[PDB]
Amino acid sequence: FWGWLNAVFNKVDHDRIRDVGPDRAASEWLLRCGAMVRYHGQQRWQKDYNHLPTGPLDKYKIQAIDATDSCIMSIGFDHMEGLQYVEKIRLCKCHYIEDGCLERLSQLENLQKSMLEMEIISCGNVTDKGIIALHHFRNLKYLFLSDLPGVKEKEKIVQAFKTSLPSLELKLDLK
């Protein structure tokens, strides 16, 4: 219904993966959902889906992800599985991101190593539960929560992190 496309765009094309390998596949899913990515090695952000590197075989790993105004959703997070090197993620004004998404991510082993830096800005459906789940990123050096109206017991988050990730810089920007 006037938006089935969301399912089409979030579909996971395991064939494509196995062909051109996870990072490439995940860059197509992302940019086609109005996200951007940045490969280890470059300063340029990939932002135009049609300009994606389609030659230099299998050298581009994904390192930072910017979902602003994006239409990604958890039925598609299988794209995030075989990603070895992701260090940054920014989620901002993404309507369909919420607690379930944050769980799924925070349970991706490959990401639990690689992640250093996360920001959740202005995503209305996320909550305290979703946030706390983020402790499983054992290497997370910094995490910015801003404009998250679904988050209530802030202070209690600050504690959980204080204990389970003692040296995480934890910028807050909450009501």
Give the residue numbers of the binding site: 34, 68
CB 33 to Mg ion: min, Å:
8
Pick the closer one to Mg ion by CB: 74 or 106: 74
Element (H, E) at 27: helix 22-32
Query: Which residues, other chains included, contact 159 with Cβ-Cβ below 8 Å and sequence gap of 6+?
Result: none
Q: Is 27 in the site for Mg ion (CB under 5 A)?
A: no
CB 27 to Mg ion: min, Å:
14
CA–CA separation, 141 and 158 (whole Å): 14
Q: Is 32 in the site for Mg ion (CB under 5 A)?
A: no
For 91, the token pair is 């989620």
Contact window for Mg ion (CB under 5 A) among 37-45, 64-72, 139-147, 164-172? 64-72
User: Could you tell me where the beta strands, DSSP code E, fall in the chain?
Assistant: 36-39, 62-68, 88-92, 117-121, 142-146, 172-173
Q: Are 174 and 143 in contact (CB under 8 A)?
A: no
Q: Is 69 in the site for Mg ion (CB under 5 A)?
A: yes
CA–CA separation, 21 and 24 (whole Å): 6
Pick the closer one to Mg ion by CB: 46 or 70: 70
Q: Is 13 in the site for Mg ion (CB under 5 A)?
A: no
When binding is defined by CB under 5 A, the residue of 12, 20, 34, 124 that contacts Mg ion is 34
When binding is defined by CB under 5 A, the residue of 10, 46, 63, 70 that contacts Mg ion is 70
Contact window for Mg ion (CB under 5 A) among 3-11, 15-23, 32-40, 83-91? 32-40
CA–CA separation, 23 and 79 (whole Å): 8
Contacting positions for Mg ion (CB under 5 A): 34, 69-70
